[PDB]
Design a protein around this ligand. Sequence first.
Ligand SMILES: Nc1ncnc2c1c(F)cn2[C@@H]1O[C@H](CO)[C@@H](O)[C@H]1O
Length: 327
Amino acid sequence: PVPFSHCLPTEKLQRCEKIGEGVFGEVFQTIADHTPVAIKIIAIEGPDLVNGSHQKTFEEILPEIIISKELSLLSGEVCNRTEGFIGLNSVHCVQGSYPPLLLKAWDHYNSTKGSANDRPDFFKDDQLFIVLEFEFGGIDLEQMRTKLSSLATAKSILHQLTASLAVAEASLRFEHRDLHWGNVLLKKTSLKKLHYTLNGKSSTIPSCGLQVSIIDYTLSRLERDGIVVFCDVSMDEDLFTGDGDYQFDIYRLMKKENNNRWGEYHPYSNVLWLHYLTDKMLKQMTFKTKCNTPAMKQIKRKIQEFHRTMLNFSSATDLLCQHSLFK
Ligand SMILES: Nc1ncnc2c1c(F)cn2[C@@H]1O[C@H](CO)[C@@H](O)[C@H]1O
């Protein structure tokens, strides 16, 4: 393992601002070579509860690391190519107590937004962490609930998500398995069209000024040459007992689809998550401009039709290739 200073030299550490969190740990934004990056920091291997949960072992965190790398590599592939995941710049195993400068950033977030996590000031100098440095992907869909222009934007977002998932199905037999709206990131782009390639066939998607990135592979699954990488949640209690959001139903619906066998490939789970995201677009997102005219009224009807028909498709690939929304 390396010290924190290896990943976060002084100037980079001084520029860290906290941008997100979960039971897993903390996410900070910083800058290096004039370029924003996001740093995800996860405590591993120790006996302390962290945010109410036991720390993962190295064996337990390896799947997320492997999947992050494979999905990032799709941006440079040829037959199955997409930029719709998030870039992975580096991964390190770090040993030490939590940097005081990161505690300062943590406190500022706690003071302004409020945190559900423990202040991470209780680690000893032998504590291990995984530090993942990602491309900065923008702002999550949940935080953009009231910030998007119109339902035309929602169409582009759904098309981008579906295309990225299809490409990862085709190349990696990928299932995200946790694509809640905190895991869909939006960034401005000046590109009018985005490009992907699916089984050697290239196409484009109108951007509506946004590029989508899918993040967070904690529950994900994929395979290469029959070697399956996944999170075995077959004995998890709490994952299947949530309430108050359709999100929590998706976990139960996945378990129904796969008969509680998480190593198998069931790309219908990607359809389920896409349905949950379409439902958010129609029910919880609110747009600056309503569908006040016809033509926008037509996009709205098409997204409603997608919502009521998409559960009859077998995979993101089937949706992309066959659904009328994308024709
Ligand atoms: N690569 C990234 N770029 C920008 N924001 C990010 C990330 C990332 F990995 C997490 N987050 C944020 O941290 C939260 C928890 O993972 C997410 O919901 C996002 O808000």
